[PDB]
Amino acid sequence: APMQAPVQAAPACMASCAPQCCGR
Numbered sequence: 001a002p003m004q005a006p007v008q009a010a011p012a013c014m015a016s017c018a019p020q021c022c023g024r
Contacts, residue, residue, distance in 0.1 A: 011023060
């Protein structure tokens, strides 16, 4: 049971397009 880092699910968020593709 290895402890993994959960990914907060973003809404179509991409750095290059962020923070617009991340809505805000």
